Amino acid sequence: EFYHLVDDYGRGNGFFDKFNFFTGDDPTHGYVDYVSRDVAAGAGLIGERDGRTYMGVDFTNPASGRGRRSVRLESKNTYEHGLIVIDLAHMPGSVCGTWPAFWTLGTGDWPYGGAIDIIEGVNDNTFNHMVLHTSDGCTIDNDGFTGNLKTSNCYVYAPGQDANAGCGIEATDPNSYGKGFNSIGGGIYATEITPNGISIWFFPRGSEPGDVLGDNPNPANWDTPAAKFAGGGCDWEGKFNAQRLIFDVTFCGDWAGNVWGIGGCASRAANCVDFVRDNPSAFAESYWLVNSLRVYAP
């Protein structure tokens, strides 16, 4: 009557089979070494934990080569419109030097297909950042959400663009990300993509609507979203094409590495790379633990 399931991603190997593992150099120039599925499994970076799907980074070995070992999974299936609901028992922590992201990326050359960052942050961030990335000609309005809008222009390369490289809204619940989020047993992030805009809701563990995990979720009746990206300043239908789901954790790089020295992690090491290379144990909390990932369509 409102939305129907188009994909339940399951768990474990069945879940992994639905993604391609990216092993190229990090597009955001981080100190990371994205490894293949076989290598990741051999290093304990992916697996199943009591029925939940685990995706993490190397928190054992001093790093070498391209950087600290991690994985970047990109879905084989793509969606032009729909509702993506992820129930997470855990997400990468608020760890200095890290830059985790659960997001979507359109087809074609970046940023022409658009991109939607659902869960994202850097270093010791407390609040989740929800950010879109588009080509020029896409700005957002100020209403319909509970978060704090930080940037209004989604064009990645706009004139005085923020380090978030897009139009971002910051959550106001400190349990929306990292440490706080893990401390409460996680929660659910629901993202709706329509021809008129994108909305993202965050439900801390136990507060989610009774229909968000079922077979007919209906966002029209949910409380105000944490972020809403809409308005006449953007062609929402044309700026985003078929999106693939992505899980990753990179380190340092364009955002985390560039703001390292001016933030709360500055005293940990002269620069981000030194820290990530020499302190493997610092990254134990940098993992995703999925209860369920389901995509729906109207």
Cα–Cα dist 115/104, whole Å: 5
Q: How many residues does the chain have?
A: 298
Cα–Cα dist 222/218, whole Å: 7
Pairing of strands 98-106, 115-120: antiparallel
Q: What is the rounded radius of gyration, in angstroms, for the C-alpha atoms of the chain?
A: 18
Comparing CA positions, the residue from 37, 95, 121 lying closest to residue 280 is 95
E strand or H helix at 224: none
Q: Letter for the amino acid at 24?
A: G
Count the Cβ atoms, other than its own, within 10 Å of residue 104.
25
Count the Cβ atoms, other than its own, within 10 Å of residue 109.
8
Q: Letter for the amino acid at 95?
A: V
Using what technique was this structure determined?
X-ray
Count the Cβ atoms, other than its own, within 10 Å of residue 230.
17
What class is the 1-298 domain?
mainly beta
Cα–Cα dist 284/220, whole Å: 38
Cα–Cα dist 182/203, whole Å: 13
Cα–Cα dist 170/147, whole Å: 5
Q: Residue 273, SS3?
A: helix
CA-to-CA dists, residue 186 to 87, 182, 272, angstroms: 8, 5, 27
Name the resolution in angstroms.
1.8
Count the Cβ atoms, other than its own, within 10 Å of residue 207.
11
Domain segments of the chain: what residues? 1-298
